[PDB]
Amino acid sequence: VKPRILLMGLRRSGKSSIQKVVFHKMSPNETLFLESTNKICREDVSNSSFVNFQIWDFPGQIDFFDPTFDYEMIFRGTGALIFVIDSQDDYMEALARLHLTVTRAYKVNTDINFEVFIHKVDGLSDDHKIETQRDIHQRANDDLADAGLEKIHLSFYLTSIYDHSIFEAFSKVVQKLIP
């Protein structure tokens, strides 16, 4: 089996940058040249001296009807779902889509590891970080409870492509997919 890791979230949250930086060692400064993602981009990690994975980079979530992705088929084969959130922008909508994403996925596969990347933290005071994470952690788990889905576990990470934090976070995600 080849474990799948999904990169989801609203447009511009930094999904593609994360993929390029972490797996293609693209420089963080080069990500300024990336363009909006229009189709899902699958990039596999094969023959790993640790563990092989499929990395799916999704275009940002928008209210556009297109029942062509067969999400049940995607989630069924998913090991980890990373929801990326831009911490330097309003995230109320981000939280709302995280809720729909997580619950829809959980309905198909309860073994999915849900990882929340509170991204672009490089632009926050080393305290504003604590508050943002505390706020996202609180609301997200509160939404889950209001739905009777408190059992769904959400891990949170403070990340930035401008330092080791994004690698440290991705590392912990991959570790959890190695039996």
Q: Which residues bind Mg ion (CB under 5 A)?
A: 15-16, 37
Gap between the Cα atoms of 25 and 109, Å rounded: 31
The interface region with ligand GNP, picked from 34-42, 46-54, 109-117, 141-149 by CB under 6 A, is 34-42
How many other CB atoms sit within 10 Å of the CB of residue 131? 11
CB of 172 to ligand GNP, least distance (A): 17
Q: Is 46 annotated as a binding residue?
A: no
For residues 35 to 74, the per-residue mask of contacts with ligand GNP, x marking binding by CB under 6 A and - elsewhere, is -xx---------------------xx--------------
Q: Residues 6 or more apart from 74 whose CB is under 8 A from it?
A: 4, 6, 56
Q: Which is nearer to Mg ion, 16 or 101 (CB)?
A: 16
Gap between the Cα atoms of 18 and 14, Å rounded: 6
Gap between the Cα atoms of 149 and 172, Å rounded: 24
- Does residue 26 touch ligand GNP according to CB under 6 A? no
- Does residue 133 touch ligand GNP according to CB under 6 A? no
Gap between the Cα atoms of 1 and 168, Å rounded: 24
CB of 151 to Mg ion, least distance (A): 31
- Does residue 13 touch ligand GNP according to CB under 6 A? yes
- Does residue 3 touch ligand GNP according to CB under 6 A? no
Which helix (H) or strand (E) element contains residue 114?
strand 113-119
Question: Rg of the chain over CA atoms, in angstroms?
Answer: 15
Applying CB under 6 A, which residues contact ligand GNP? 9, 11-17, 31-32, 34, 36-37, 59-60, 119-120, 122-123, 160-162
